[PDB]
Amino acid sequence: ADGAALYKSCIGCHGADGSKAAMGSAKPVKGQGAEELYKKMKGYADGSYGGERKAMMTNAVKKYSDEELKALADYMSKL
Ligand code: HEC
């Protein structure tokens, strides 16, 4: 569905421009790279990836699925 809409909640930690180094100190999500973003989201979706707050991430990400994840990464890749 619309990546921007799906990411609306995420914007809370990542910042409006997805550049706020989210809580732990996320690498600015803004333009991380769609492939990157998606590979990592899939990773958290299934649980085969980590980070400072990988758990929070996984829990959030769980809401989506491959299509929604692709859209989210596509959005985050432009931000
Ligand atoms: C604050 C508690 C966060 C909320 C809410 C969401 N995200 Fe996040 N995200 C957070 C951190 C600390 C990081 C960096 C990795 C780490 O834990 O060290 C991330 C990362 C992402 C990424 C990129 C992965 C990377 O390696 O940087 C994506 C694609 C991402 N976040 C998506 C995402 C979604 C879909 C959210 C809303 C449902 C969301 N995040 C919320 C911290 C936080």
Where residue 64 sits, what CATH number does that domain have?
1.10.760.10
Total domains in the chain come to 1
Residue 30: give the domain boundaries: 1-79
DSSP at 16:
T
Calpha distance 48→46 (Å, rounded): 6
Cβ-based burial of 16 (10 A; exposed 0-12, middle 13-18, buried ≥19): exposed
Asked if residue 10 belongs to a known ligand binding site, the reply is yes
Pocket around ligand 1 at a 6 A CB cut-off? 7, 9-10, 12-14, 22-24, 26-27, 29, 32, 37, 40-41, 51-54, 56-57, 60-61, 72, 76
- What 7-12 contacts at long range (C-beta under 8 Å, 24+ apart), as own/partner pairs, is 7/72, 7/75, 7/76, 9/60, 10/60, 10/72
This entry's atomic model was obtained through: NMR
Question: Other CB atoms closer than 10 Å to residue 61's CB: what's the count?
Answer: 23
Pick the closest to residue 49 from 32, 65, 37, 31 (CA basis): 37
Ligand 1, from 9, 14, 36: best to mutate by most atoms within 8 Å of Cβ?
A: 14
